[PDB]
Ligand SMILES: N[C@@H](CCC(=O)N[C@@H](CSCc1ccc([N+](=O)[O-])cc1)C(=O)NCC(=O)O)C(=O)O
């Protein structure tokens with residue numbers, strides 16, 4: 560069985576902080592102990608027609624393994640989790656709820672974060688910057704209130720560590736620079752619990768090596 | 773085996789057009805021939821602490837079947853598709869690609885649409901409305917260019933009709949009122965192909981009956 564190959568930025572705009580969407584894929588591969596390879600793409604290469612055969616929207620990551628080509632970080636993590644052990648529970652009820660939280664990370668929490676970080680980072684010096692910022696921030700804090708209340712004292716989202724936690728923690732890490740998570744003690748601790756796992760460190764060190772290459 | 777129950781708006785803000793996120797769930801249930809029930813929620817009821825036991829962010833839809841409670845329209849469709857026939861292919865490679873397109877509908881196409889419709893509908897009379905509109909519209913047209921080029925002459929996204937088409941068509945329908953799809957002949961035809969299916973009509977008539985009740 561051939562190791563998979565994933566596409567990643569040659570020069571990531573994240574400063575080596577492991578915030579690009581290859582990170583949850585790398586982390587999933589490390590959790591299941593699957594060796595993998597990367598193909599580094601320049602910004603120009605990502606826009607070439609050849610890359611569209613791998614990712615139809617000219618983005619990263621894609622995943623190639625033999626005849627299989629996949630895209631969507633969420634779907635790539637799903638595929639890894641479906642064919643190895645340790646990222647999805649065996650019990651069918653628990654599994655279905657784990658998949659709910661995978662979708663929630665990407666389709667409920669992520670949009671609230673990105674609506675905020677887009678205004679915060681990309682739209683300064685064109686008002687009402689601070690005004691649009693205040694609105695998206697209010698909606699974000701409401702979603703974090705909801706997530707925090709639901710999580711309570713749980714170690715992970717659905718019993719044992721899962722693919723949902725990989726996706727949710729990588730999404731929440733987009734808030735590290737803002738300091739917003741300091742106001743949500745259990746969410747901060749949750750993110751730190753994930754970052755302390757050895758597979759997280761192996762994935763993080765690998766994206767950092769691409770950055771410092 | 774008990775029929776599932778899904779939560780829906782008592783008075784949907786969509787004018788009976790079947791654009792709320794219960795629609796893809798209803799459509800999936802109708803495609804697999806699973807009878808189901810609905811629980812209608814007032815806007816006030818959706819905000820009560822009791823609803824949080826079903827949907828932690830106070831939104832619809834949720835899905836209840838015996839001991840199983842799920843949320844996330846994408847994950848609910850996934851669950852339906854995993855335990856019935858006709859929405860996911862049996863071949864493992866084709867199945868993985870179908871899941872990629874389910875995620876793409878919600879995590880690549882949907883955000884580009886919603887970034888546009890949010891400005892277009894919710895942010896008039898606070899400039900630079902037309903300016904922010906132009907920016908989100910440009911990003912949307914680029915994603916539609918990409919989706920259209922990839923689809924080509926395919927009947928459906930991954931061979932046979934699938935859960936990916938349910939999610940993608942319901943997302944694309946948020947553009948009907950804008951007329952934008954008229955400029956993408958194959959995408960328009962794709963949406964119409966889905967809307968012509970008898971299960972789509974059964975789902976649509978049911979949400980309309982809640983509206984006209
Ligand atoms: N839905 C897709 C979305 C993929 C995507 O957004 N890819 C981005 C990279 S991750 C998003 C990202 C970018 C930058 C940072 N950062 O911290 O600098 C973090 C995350 C990309 O290729 N962008 C280049 C382009 O659009 O041309 C998925 O989840 O796989």
Ligand SMILES: N[C@@H](CCC(=O)N[C@@H](CSCc1ccc([N+](=O)[O-])cc1)C(=O)NCC(=O)O)C(=O)O
Pocket residue numbers: 663666667784785786787791792793794818830831832833843844845846
């Ligand atoms: N990620 C979740 C998102 C759920 C969600 O956004 N639910 C919305 C309804 S569908 C979104 C929607 C709303 C309105 C129209 N419309 O046409 O009027 C279409 C779609 C909701 O409950 N909103 C009420 C609230 O936030 O208080 C999922 O996919 O299930």
